[model samples]
Target: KPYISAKDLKEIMYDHLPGFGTAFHQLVQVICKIGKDNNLLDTIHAEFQASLADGDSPQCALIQITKRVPIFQDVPPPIIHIRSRGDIPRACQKSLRPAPPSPKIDRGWVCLFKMQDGKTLGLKI
Candidate 1:
C-alpha cells in the first residue's frame, strides 16, 4: 500500500483504540506530523499492510506498531503554557496544586513554572 495520510492514520487509530478515544487532538496532530516529516508514515503503512496481509486484525496491526514505535506507547500530551496570571483565574493559577485522583488526558501531573524568559511553562510530569 501507499503512504498513509493523516486522515487515514486517524481513522486507523480510532478503529484500533476504540475505548482510548481521540480527545487528545494536539497529541495526535503532532504524532501524525512527525510521522510524515520523518517518512515514518510510509514505514508504518508498509508494516500495517504487511500485518494485514499476514491475517492480523487492524487492532493487532496497531499493537504491532506500538511495539515498533516506543514513543506511541507511553508518550505524554504536549503541555499548554500559561504565560501570565491574567491568562487564567488567580485562584487556579498557582505554581502547583495537590495531585488529582488521575492525570486523565496525559496520564501525568501538570505543573507550571516561571522561566527567566518571563513565560510560565506548563509541563507534564
Candidate 2:
C-alpha cells in the first residue's frame, strides 16, 4: 500500500485535534480556530521549507508535527503487577500471536477505494 500523501496527511492531522465531537461541521471549524491559535500553518510551512532540500515534502513535515503534537497521546501498554495467576486482568491474558508487519516507511497508511465514477479515490487512514 502507498503511504499517505501530503495533502491528506495534513487533513488527517487536523482531525486529530481534541474538541467536542458533537458535530462534524463544528469540528471542521474548530480546527481552523485551533490551527490559527497553535500556528499549525506556520509550523507546517516552516518545516516544509527546512526539509525541502532533503526531498521531504509536507507529508514528512506532518509526520514530524504529529510526533511533537501533544493531542495524539501515545499510550504505552500497562505494566501488570501480578502476584498470582488469577491476578492477571482478562484484557492482558491473551495468548501470544505473531506481530503484525510494520511498514517499511513509518510515515502513515493509505486505503484505496473504488468510486462509482470511473476513478479510484485514495484515502489516508
Give me the candidate number with maximum TM-score: 1
lDDT by residue for model 2 (19-107), tens: 33212222233323334544465443344346555676443544543344443223211122334433322322232122233311112
Against the hidden true structure, what lDDT does model 1 obtain?
A: 0.50
What are the lDDT figures for the candidates, one per model?
0.50, 0.34
What TM-scores do the predictions have?
0.40, 0.27
Distance from true location, Cα of 51 in model 2, Å? 2.3
For candidate 2, the lDDT comes to: 0.34
lDDT of 1 at 121: 42
Question: How well is each residue in 1-111 modelled by candidate 1, as lDDT tens digits?
Answer: 335787787666565554442222223444565466555776766666687888987656654554565555454433445555455434334433443433322332333
The 10-residue segment of model 2 with minimum total lDDT is 103-112
